[PDB]
């Protein structure tokens, strides 16, 4: 077909793993899981390959419909062009499908600052303006999940001092209790549902 329309195919598939790392919700889901593991004490349970796997699958549900929609838009044969500028605006009209998604979560004041610094909305301002908000949202959402595990450690450590049982190390005891309390309550389901529901 058209050669410049070919080069763009090969470039895109070469960049794809770096785009998913910033311009996609994969950023938020994977992060929250590693912090919850971290707070449970035991490490590499689940294995890293679990976490980055499910986060990758769950994210496709949210992004894949948007991608499909972008290509189906360009396939309409009924369009016609008469000038270079007419083409640029027509292409831009396609990206609105994705832009509208980024605009929802990115904070207004970051984008406006980058849109000014850009001189001397634009996607290049919405990528870094989005990546910083999805990071920040995870440290909030996670902090509330540390509270109950802190309570469990303080309670048992205080119990140990009621039995007058000094210099036992209050970690052997509490590590397994956190898992049983969390795993017996299907925490991982309630967690996963709470994430998808924000975006689906």
């Amino acid at each position: 077909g058209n050669d410049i329309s070919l080069i763009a195919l090969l470039a895109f598939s070469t960049l794809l793993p770096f785009i998913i790392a910033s311009g996609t919700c994969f950023v938020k889901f994977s992060i929250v899981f590693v912090m919850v593991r971290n707070a449970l004490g035991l490490q590499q349970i689940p294995s890293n390959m679990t976490l980055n796997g499910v986060a990758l699958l769950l994210s496709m549900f949210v992004m894949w419909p948007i991608m499909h929609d972008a290509y189906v838009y360009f396939e309409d044969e009924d369009v016609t062009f008469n000038d270079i500028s007419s083409l640029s605006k027509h292409v831009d009209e396609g990206l609105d499908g994705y832009r509208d998604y980024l605009i929802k979560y990115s904070d207004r004041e970051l984008v406006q600052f980058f849109e000014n610094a850009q001189l001397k909305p634009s996607i290049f301002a919405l990528l870094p303006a989005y990546a910083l908000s999805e990071i920040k949202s995870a440290f909030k959402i996670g902090f509330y999940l540390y509270l109950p595990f802190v309570v469990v450690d303080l309670v048992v450590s205080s119990v140990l001092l009621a039995l007058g049982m000094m210099m036992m190390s209050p970690v052997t005891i509490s590590t397994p209790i956190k898992l049983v309390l969390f795993v017996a309550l299907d925490g991982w389901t309630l967690l996963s549902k709470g994430l998808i529901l924000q975006y689906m």
């Binding site: 329309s5 044969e77 009924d78």
Partner: peptide
């Protein structure tokens, strides 16, 4: 010039 500009 038409949509034939937008495929490989």
């Amino acid at each position: 010039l038409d949509d034939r500009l937008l495929q490989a």
